[PDB]
Amino acid sequence: FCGSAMATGKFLIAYSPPGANPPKTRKDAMLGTHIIWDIGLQSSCVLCVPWISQTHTSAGYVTCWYQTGMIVPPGTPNSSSIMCFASACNDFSVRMLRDTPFISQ
Amino acid sequence: RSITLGNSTITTQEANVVVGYGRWPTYLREDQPTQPDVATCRFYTLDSIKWEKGSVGWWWKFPEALSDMGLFGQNMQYHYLGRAGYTIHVQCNASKFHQGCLLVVCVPEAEMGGAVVGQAFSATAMANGDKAYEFTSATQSDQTKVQTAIHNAGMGVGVGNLTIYPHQWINLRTNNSATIVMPYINSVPMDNMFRHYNFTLMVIPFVKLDYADTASTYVPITVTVAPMCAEYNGLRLAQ
Amino acid sequence: RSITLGNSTITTQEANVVVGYGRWPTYLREDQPTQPDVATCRFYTLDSIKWEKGSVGWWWKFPEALSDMGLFGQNMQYHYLGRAGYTIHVQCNASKFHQGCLLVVCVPEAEMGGAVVGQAFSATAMANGDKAYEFTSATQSDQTKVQTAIHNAGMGVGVGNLTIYPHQWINLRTNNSATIVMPYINSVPMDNMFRHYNFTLMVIPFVKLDYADTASTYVPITVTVAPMCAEYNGLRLAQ
Amino acid sequence: SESTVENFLGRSACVYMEEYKTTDNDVNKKFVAWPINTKQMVQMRRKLEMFTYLRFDMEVTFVITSRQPVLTHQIMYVPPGGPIPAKVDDYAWQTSTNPSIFWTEGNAPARMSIPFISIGNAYSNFYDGWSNFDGSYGYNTLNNLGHIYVRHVSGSSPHPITSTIRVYFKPKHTRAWVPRPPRLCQYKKAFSVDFTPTPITDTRKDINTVTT
Description:
part of a larger assembly; 4 chains; A: mainly beta; three-stranded antiparallel sheet; B: mainly beta; Jelly Rolls; seven-stranded mixed sheet; 1 helix; globular; Capsid protein VP3 (chain A); virus; icosahedral symmetry; expanded virion
């Protein structure tokens, strides 16, 4: 969370196993695996997603929902943003070299 | 700090825990087999409630507020006798430019007299889903309603003397969180889950919310409940 | 005697067990978490099949025959990779004034060629519910059917040489029961439960039923299957 | 101390008073009938509603007077789930599982102590629930107590006697669990928590007024 230092609020970050529909409401996205991220006490929350595969679909989903809006005191910006980072762990394995499909001669 | 509790649902929080009557939830220690379900223990987060300048109170009946929740609410459909304690975390998010006081309180076996004396009311006049009911400042005067005057608590008692039950005060200029661990209190060991409401939870704001100009017009209140040590009657033949 | 096996479902029975390839069902011994469900182990008794003078054979595809069964059939809806072995008990009830022979056999990965060469058929032409399919004495000649000629087994092989797979013979003048414990056989560790049929079960009567006069005109065959050592992919986050 | 729960509720007090005449047009005025409950005495109701669960034995003593030989009176306790009489004389008074006291006048008052009768582990003063499921709110059958029927014993020929029965009741060996805050509103019913909102306290005049 990259907003002000005076902002507070919560978010519910849900996770759906591969081969399962993404939740359609906040209510049923809380019956899966989830983390209540509080931006008043934390500034970063980390997930570690298992079962990532080439799949050559069925894939997991990560969704995020409003839980108790965002609350700010007087004289504070009315908008904030969230950035996202991603990387492999260390369990990755790669096999069979081939040309990238992002280059055209 | 942050304790970062987990059970399959992670809640980061933190005042200190107020244990009911000094008794923690506990398993009941034949011709009655019994058996616990330990997969029901996990947080269930009810929808946020807007605390505004208008609002004068709220209430929820348990365990009829967790009836639609997955697994815990499905054991009520099968097993016909049950018991369980609870761990309730009520927490607000507010600035330092807001002010208010709340009283989180758990009242066991709170009967509520109807509005209009000598008149029966439905069971949807105080419990339905996980929806939060609301007290009214002025006296109720409707045929199919509970008496919701805030200064009598809907029971004809002083509202100031509800500090005789497990409680904690969320004063916004000090703390912002409260935790109550309620044990199972009843006159029998197990009872049907739909015919009885073990207790009610109430949030009552003494000192109205105020917040000056160009600041958020509400403070959200978020209730989170995880059942502890639930146990039900067995469904298999004896030897 | 009577061994009186129990699991939450009691079956009294008893020949001897024929273990697949000499391998018992076993758990698979990260980035793939896994986790077994041990509450799926229990007998599931399929409907009785009338063996008459007409009938020439039957078949069932697994694990699509246990898809509607409680719990085991509900894990196929959730988890998208699974495995499991099986214990199958086929048993008849007949007098000493009846005669017949049966071949209980489990054929792993039995492809079946269609009736009318070069024609596609639906997936309801060989598997649907727990319903038992039927072989026909005469050659099939219908557009949307599997070739069901009994003397080719629906695969273009000798019907006499199906004793190369796990099998046992129920000769009515000796025994009346057979048991096959099939392990998990596949070229991958786990596979989707709806896109693949691990094996098929077949009951083929060599020597037709005969029973003289004023005796029961059929002998019932009762299949009972309990999955052993089932395991599925985990559904929770890693650390 | 006198502040123990035992001595607080240990007091004995009148709870029911009724009259009957032996010879009367009505047949329901030839005998007393009285469901035992502690919700009829306003003064003692408030002291037993400061707790949510109570467990006690009962001691019931009767004071009988008569107005126009020796006069005898049967006093029959009917345990919950026993036969109940509907007439001055019927087979419900001949039942051998209903305790009875045959007391004559000019002797020290009749008395008996009914133990804790309930299949629960305590009586409950408050019950928030339903009986069948959504003439059912706030009533359960575990806190039910018996009945007492008097009836003047006489020959085959009745004779006019008017009697007055007073019942005294004392909790004994009380245990109590879970406080409640004391009642603030007046009672408007004998079996409901129904009330009409009342002010919190009596008004002063100004916040700085402290005159005696």
